[PDB]
Amino acid sequence: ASPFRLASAGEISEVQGILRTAGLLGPEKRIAYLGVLDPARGAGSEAEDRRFRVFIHDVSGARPQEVTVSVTNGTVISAVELDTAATGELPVLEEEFEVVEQLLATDERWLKALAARNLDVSKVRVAPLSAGVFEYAEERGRRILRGLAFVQDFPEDSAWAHPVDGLVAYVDVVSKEVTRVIDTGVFPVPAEHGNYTDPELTGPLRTTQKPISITQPEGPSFTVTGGNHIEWEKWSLDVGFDVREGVVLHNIAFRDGDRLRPIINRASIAEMVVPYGDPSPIRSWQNYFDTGEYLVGQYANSLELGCDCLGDITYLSPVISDAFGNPREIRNGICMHEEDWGILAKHSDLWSGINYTRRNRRMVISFFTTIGNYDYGFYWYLYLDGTIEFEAKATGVVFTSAFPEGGSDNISQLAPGLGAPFHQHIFSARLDMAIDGFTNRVEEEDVVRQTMGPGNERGNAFSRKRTVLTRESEAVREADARTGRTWIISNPESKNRLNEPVGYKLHAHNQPTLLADPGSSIARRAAFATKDLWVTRYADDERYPTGDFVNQHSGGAGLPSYIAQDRDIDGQDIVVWHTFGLTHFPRVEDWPIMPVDTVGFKLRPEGFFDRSPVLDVPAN
Amino acid sequence: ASPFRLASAGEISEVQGILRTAGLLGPEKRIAYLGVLDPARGAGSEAEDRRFRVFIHDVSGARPQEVTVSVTNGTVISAVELDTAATGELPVLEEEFEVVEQLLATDERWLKALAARNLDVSKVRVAPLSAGVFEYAEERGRRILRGLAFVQDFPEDSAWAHPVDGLVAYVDVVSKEVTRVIDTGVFPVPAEHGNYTDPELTGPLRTTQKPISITQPEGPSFTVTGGNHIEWEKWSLDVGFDVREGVVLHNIAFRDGDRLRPIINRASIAEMVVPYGDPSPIRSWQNYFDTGEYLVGQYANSLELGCDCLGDITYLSPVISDAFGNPREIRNGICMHEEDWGILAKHSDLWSGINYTRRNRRMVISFFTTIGNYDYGFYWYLYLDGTIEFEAKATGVVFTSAFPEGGSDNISQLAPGLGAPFHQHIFSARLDMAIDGFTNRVEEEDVVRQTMGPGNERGNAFSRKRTVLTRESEAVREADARTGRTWIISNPESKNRLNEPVGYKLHAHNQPTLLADPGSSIARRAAFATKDLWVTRYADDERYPTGDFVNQHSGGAGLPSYIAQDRDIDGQDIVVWHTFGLTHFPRVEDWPIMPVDTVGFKLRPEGFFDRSPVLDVPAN
Ligand SMILES: [Cu+2]
Ligand SMILES: [Cu+2]
Fold first, then answer.
1. Measured distance CA(B63)–CA(B86) in Å, rounded
2. Which PANTHER family does this UniProt record tie to the protein (chains A, B)?
3. Could you tell me which residues are beta bridge partners of residue A443?
């Protein structure tokens, strides 16, 4: 049907068959990443050509390959061998995560470290984390995972309450060798448990909460058609899913009268980085690229009706590939429902005697993921008035360490002896703009304060200014909350009835960006996180702000290299990349399990419609 | 019962009697403001003294008086004469607002101005706005109102669509004279209507919205006792109401196990300024002090179930006094209910096999107000995890002007010939802090970036710094979104189990503050709006950031004067004043009736509890 429909089990199996038939997927090959490609720029030449991109890992050490297949034609479009020491390693595989603990359990220098702390190796859990790129020259070209230990006193015990500081091990997951075990010194292992399900900790459960029922007697107001095509209160779009990005939104458009007007071609969280600010050698290399290195969509939870979703929910169950190319469905991995959102508009007019009130509502498209200790909720919102919003919810268990005796400037104390290294959770929203079509431009709008004097005698006047970002060289911008800075994306050839280019304004939260030193490995690898907004000229191969292969990949790829092309963005097919994140100084209230904290952004129409789009909302 | 209970109809009647009997309530006397005083510090002699403060205006020109009466002892505790030219004028009375259109209709200059524009005087609505204090010497001591005209073509017509630019009148509401009429020139009167209820405009109402039913089969989880005492999910507070301030929250506390721990003594929106940034002499004096000059609680709406408030709602009907001392009930003027707020906390642990999720919820306490063209929703939220939040929702109809030919740097176009002057809506939340009691302190917390080098060789470290505001001359702070600036209120004599002073962190939205030139009259009269956070030593006569008599007061009246005392705030009974607002450059979608836009702030526990205060919430 629509070329934006979700990949089916059938197409996944066909990609396997096609790869096999071509000699690309033998018994030593593993699919590190498989995802469907978006229809190319230029419309549908005729029937759809469903292509799938695949990253093929070789467990015997042979160079991996990037291959694009056409499930439609049953062909292999291309297949290049990769020089990983140059362009980067493939995403870490599940089977390689499970390798770290077992290998360390028989290494004598690990065992020696545990014995020095009187720890039973059978109770030491290891958090296998991406290695990143530092001064370990022997690592270049190898697939390394670093391990941090946590004690789990019993089966239902939360190991995070018992971090083993002073110890870290590096493991080559292909050759299956422990390359290094570093023991900086012993630290007491925090003794208090963080078992949030233990009645001794929780105490008697509250009997005070009365139920709140959210029903929809006639069902929801949105329609799901062709599997993933949604239509709700004038909004139109396709809900896609990628194992790396999670939920992706395609063809976001609004039905303004008789015209379906495009707003956003593609919207996704293209990268997610979690950098740690503890300078201890045990953790100073700690930086997760949850989207790039781990593939967040892969870890999506199965949303259950009642627990994760209240009201009339419509679930989608995306299909992804396992490491062998077989289809694996994520049951109820995508949650869809509409919710009441208070008052939309209101006015009691004295002169006319007319009292008016209208209710607001938003369409919610979300999914939840679990990456080790953290759990993240990704929410896209569509509002009656044309506003588009994204919200990320961070929860789970805080990553722990020992709390230093003499206190710390980079770690906070959660319990006695228990510490929590400072860190950030920074996201990158890739917004492939289509404001009334692809001819778009971006302007940075700052509030302008005026001096009291001629033409402003009472000194009360204030204005606003807009600077067009013409070339990619000048499209890397920072926030300025003080002057109310925003960025408007307009179509300089689609004007409203008042003869002004139609547009949408981006409202950022103005949270701190990447804090690490500019010369740091993380500043280079996650250069996108150092600025709030980037604008590029669309290019089908520029998909992630960090590049295609983030795992153990140095700088040299991603936004900084795309931008260097210095293309024309003034009234062109453009893409907006917005950096937004949380700076977390853990607090006692975050222990033993953290309450949801949130971050996001939104876009509101700015002269897009000829008047309010909600004049037709029923009184109801 | 409680000394915090809402004023009774009987107490208002009693204040009236007491005033009458003391000869304070003569034929020419009007009650411009009446409100119950809250119990003073201590309350030792558990002896109630229900006092009421009143501002009495004299219609015949005599000096007004501030009177405090005791309803419990039927006494007139105080009665002072006010030198308004010195201390500012009393709030504007309802009867004086009406008077403006009437007196102008029989004025020759006025009628002459209308005749030149061919406007039928009986169709010309006049907006009576505060005068403020400008170059008009003959205004000092006099109660002046300024009128801007809007044509109302028919009874049910929205006059806002037809501003009459180039014209403005000044009126002495006491001597009832039109002191001046200014006609700077004729401007076409926008002809298009903005009747959002008219089917020619709305078009056929949409039939796509399905109902969303929010019920509570067992009633809500909160209990209202003593008329206004709320107990909900460990929270405890008293919902007060003031004609000037609106909903006021008293004794906000949290039951941490055995102790009911105080957090905030008194929370209220102490002022609301709406400055316009159009340098046109027709409007360059326009600044509404919605709380100070017009009294927000006075124009509260009766919240209609299903329309304004959806779900299981509990209403409170506060009682105010009319201009003659008679009690007037604001039926359903306060809306109360609890609502689902998505996920509170969640974690799927691989090592333990325990999957955990909890639903969050918030207690909503709100009221809605209409001030001429705008409508504002004031919401206070209490969350399960101890977070307190306030949110202001702005709707209504934008104040209009003519859009000048050639455009404008200070006005935007909403329709053909219809302009919308740029303006801000800036609020002042007065937070009388009581973190575990009155001994409080405030620190400004900035994120701290570190340079790569010794002790931070990988350049990944980042810390935070806190500066304690010791004296009031150091307690006037500005935002810095870039360094993640927040402000923490702690009790230095109350430590949590990790031995750190308990606290609450204030998270501002960091919107722009007052834009007017520093030397402007508005900058002086609304100096509070020029900075984000103010901390002052508590004093029972320091209630408003603009002072007690904002109407036509010259400048520097409140916050700047209080702060001038330079008292000790390091570990004292303190009050935090947070300035926050919207900077509005109206857009085409704000016309004919604007969709809700919002601002707010929130405070989160910062090491207040010894661990997560929500471990006892059930799974449900
Ligand atoms: Cu965090
Ligand atoms: Cu406004």
1. 12
2. COPPER AMINE OXIDASE (PTHR10638), COPPER AMINE OXIDASE 1-RELATED (PTHR10638:SF86)
3. A468, A488
List the 577-606 stretch of A: residues with Cβ below 8 A of B.
Answer: 583, 585, 587-596, 605-606
Minimal CA separation from A15 to chain B, in Å? 31
Could you give the strand order of the β-sheet that contains A124-130, starting from the edge strand earlier in sequence? A124-130, A144-151, A167-172, A177-183
Comparing CA positions, the residue from A118, A129, A119, A116 lying closest to residue A168 is: A129
CATH number assigned to the domain comprising residue A464: 2.70.98.20
Residues B234 and B171 in one domain: no
**A76 and A218 assigned to the same domain:** no
Whether omega before A199 lies within 30 degrees of 0, making that bond cis, reads no
- Method used to determine the 3D structure: X-ray
> Which ligand is in closest contact with the Cα of B288?
2
CA of B119 to the centre of ligand 2 (A): 28
For residue A559, the surrounding DSSP H or E stretch is: helix A559-563
- Of A147, A153, A146, the C-alpha closest to A119 is A153
Residue of chain B whose alpha carbon sits nearest to that of A520: B459
> Do A156 and A206 have their domain in common?
no
| Cα A425 to ligand 1 centroid, rounded to whole Å | 6
Q: Say if residues A487 and A445 touch (Cβ distance below 8 Å).
A: yes
Residue spans of beta strands (DSSP E) within A460-573 = 462-469, 476-477, 486-495, 501-508, 533-537
Q: Last residue of some domain: B163, B195, B227?
A: B195
Q: B11 vs chain A: nearest CA distance in angstroms?
A: 30
Number of domains in chain B: 3
Q: Are B587 and A607 in contact (CB under 8 A)?
A: yes
Residues spanned by the domain of A70: 1-87
How far out from the chain centre does Cα B253 lie? 22
Q: Are residues B284 and B384 in the same domain?
A: yes
Does the annotation list A376 as a binding residue? yes
Do residues B574 and B440 make contact, with C-beta atoms less than 8 angstroms apart? yes
* B229 and B176 belong to one structural domain: no
Candidate from B196, B343, B396 with C-beta closest to A393: B343
Distance between Cα A163 and ligand 1 center (Å): 17
CA distance B183 to B166: 5
Q: Are A144 and A173 in contact (CB under 8 A)?
A: yes
Indicate yes or no: CB of A277 within 8 angstroms of CB of B615.
Answer: no
Nearest chain B residue (CA) to A153: B352
Q: Which of A460, A500, A592 sits opposite B277 (nearest CB)?
A: A460
Please return the burial class of A594, using the count of CB atoms within 10 Å of its CB with bins 0-12, 13-18 and 19+: buried
Using an 8 Å CB-CB cutoff, list chain A residues near B461. Answer: 277-279, 284, 410, 516
Residue labelled with tokens 């869809």: A336
Q: State the DSSP code for B108.
A: H
Of B508, B509, B521, B593, nearest to B554 (Cα)? B521
Q: Name the CA radius of gyration of chain A, rounded.
A: 26
Please tell me whether residues B416 and B459 are part of one structural domain: yes
Residue A427: Cβ within 10 Å count:
24
In this complex, is the C-beta atom of A353 within 8 Å of any C-beta atom belonging to chain B? Answer: yes
Chain B residues 141-160 with a CB less than 8 Å from chain A: 152, 155-159
Considering the domain architecture, whether residues B142 and B61 belong to the same structural domain is answered as no
Give the residue among A349, A400, A390 at the shortest CA–CA distance from A160.
A400
Q: Are residues B265 and B141 in the same domain?
A: no
Q: Which residue type occupies B131?
A: A
Task: Tell which of B165, B195, B225 closes a domain.
Answer: B195
CB of A570 closer than 8 Å to CB of A108: no
The alpha carbon of residue B157 is apart from the nearest alpha carbon of chain A, in Å, by 6
Resolution of the entry in angstroms? 2.2
As given in the structure block, the two tokens for residue A560 are 């900084």
What is the C-alpha to C-alpha distance for residues A569 and B518, in angstroms, rounded to an integer? 38
Output the domain CATH number for residue B105. Answer: 3.10.450.40
Query: Are A435 and A496 in contact, with CB atoms under 8 Å apart?
Result: no
